[PDB]
Amino acid sequence: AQNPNCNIMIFHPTKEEFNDFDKYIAYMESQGAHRAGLAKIIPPKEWKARETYDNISEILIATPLQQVASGRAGVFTQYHKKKKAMTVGEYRHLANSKKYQTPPHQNFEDLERKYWKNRIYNSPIYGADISGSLFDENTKQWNLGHLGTIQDLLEKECGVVIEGVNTPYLYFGMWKTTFAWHTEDMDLYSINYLHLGEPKTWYVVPPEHGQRLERLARELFPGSSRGCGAFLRHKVALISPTVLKENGIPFNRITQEAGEFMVTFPYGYHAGFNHGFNCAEAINFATPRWIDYGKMASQCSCGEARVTFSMDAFVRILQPERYDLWKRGQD
Ligand SMILES: O=C(O)CNC(=O)C(=O)O
Ligand SMILES: [Mg+2]
Ligand code: NI
Ligand SMILES: [Zn+2]
Asked: Under DSSP, is residue 29 helix (H, G, I), strand (E, B) or coil?
C-alpha cells in the first residue's frame, strides 16, 4: 500500500505531465497521495495562470463576511456577519490597515502560534465564494474554469444525464481569515490555486480517519451535534492542532504559497487560515473513484447547510432514499 502513514505529498509535474489533468490525478493516487486527504502540486516553471495581476482591483466583493468567533482559543465556532460591498482594491487596503494586517513574526511557525493564540479576539473580513475566474482563457493546462464537469463525469460513469453546472469561485483573504473543518459537498474533490499574495496554512485528516474527527466534534460541540447529525456541513467549527493532538486525532499540516495548487480528496476533512492579503480560486471536481464516496456522503437536512443548485441531482441520483428529507432541508 502506497503512503501508508498518510503524509501530505508534494508533486512537481513537468510541462508534459501537466497536459492531461485527469491522468495526473490518477498518477498521484497511484502513489498514495489521496491517503493524506490533501496534496500540493507545484506547476512547471514554464507555466503561468495569467500574465499579470495588475488589473484586478475593480472586481466586486458584493457580500464581504466578518468572521466572528465564540468559544475558547482552540475550540471555537465562527459566524459570518454580512458587510457592505467593496471592491478588491478597497478590500486590499483594508487587509493592509493597522487593524487587520499581519503582525510581525519570525517564520510560518511563529505566525501559526500567533493565529491559534489570538484568532478568537479578532473578527477578520473574508471575500469568499465569489463566482468567477482569474485564469487567462489562453492558459490551457490546469485552468480551473476549463475542467471536465462533475455532471459529465456522472454521465460518463453511470449513464444518467443531469441538469447543473460546475464553475469556479474566488476567495479574497486577509490575516486570520479562516476556513472551518469540512469535507466538500457530496465528498467531492476540490482544487485550489493561490493566485497571489500571502500564504494559506492547511490542516487535514486522512479520509480513512474522518469519523475520528467527527466523533471528537460531537464531543466538543455537543449542542450543535444534537441539532444536526452532520453539523460539520455547516462549516462553522474550528479545532486547533494542539486539541487534535491531545485527543489523538491523526492529521497533517502544510502551507501553500502563491503559485501553488492544492488538491483535496474525497472525504478529506480540512481547515485552515490565511496569512495576509491573498486571492485563491477553487472548484470541485470528480473522478471515477469519487462515485462511491458520493453515494455514502453524509448530509445536513436541518436547513443550515443550504447549497448550490447542482447538488440536487447528485443527491437525487446517488442517494435516492435520502432525497426527500434532504430536499425538505433545502426548502
Ligand atoms: O480557501 C478557502 O477559504 C477554503 N478552500 C477550500 O476549502 C478548498 O479549496 O477546498
Ligand atoms: Mg478589475
Ligand atoms: Ni474545501
Ligand atoms: Zn444541519
From this structure: helix
Sign of CA dihedral 95, 251, 182, 284: positive
3 is in an annotated binding site: no
Alpha carbons 274 and 256: distance in angstroms, whole number: 10
Experimental method: X-ray
Beta strands in 57-121 (DSSP E): 60-61, 65-72, 75-82, 86-87
Nearest atom within ligand 1 for CA of residue 280: 1
Q: 183 in ligand 1 pocket by Cβ < 6 Å?
A: no
Report whether residue 192 contacts ligand 1, using a CB cutoff of 6 Å: yes
In the reported structure, the alpha carbon of residue 85 is separated from the centroid of ligand 2 by a whole-number distance in angstroms of 15
Distance CA 156, CA 228 (A): 34
Query: How many domains, the chain?
Result: 1
Which of 176, 190, 236, 263 has most ligand 1 atoms within 8 Å of its beta carbon, as the pocket-test mutant? 190
| Of 280, 264, 262, nearest in space to 43 by CA | 262
Query: What domain range includes position 313?
Result: 1-331
- Residue 170 near ligand 1, beta carbon < 6 Å: no
Centroid of ligand 3 to alpha carbon of 184 (angstroms):
5
Residue 120 DSSP one-character state: G
- CA–CA distance, 65 with 279 (Å, rounded to integer): 15
Cα–Cα distance for residue pair 17/19, rounded to 1 Å: 6
181 pocket-lining for ligand 1 (C-beta < 6 Å): no
Beta-strand runs (E) in the chain:
9-11, 38-41, 60-61, 65-72, 75-82, 86-87, 125-131, 169-173, 178-182, 189-197, 200-205, 237-239, 252-256, 261-264, 269-274, 278-285
Going from the Cα of 190 to the center of ligand 3, the distance in angstroms, rounded, reads: 6
Distance of alpha carbon 79 from alpha carbon 171, whole angstroms: 17
Q: What is the resolution of this structure in A?
A: 1.4
C-beta 189 within 6 A of ligand 1? no
Atom 3, ligand 1: residue with shortest CA distance = 179
- CATH for 80: 2.60.120.650
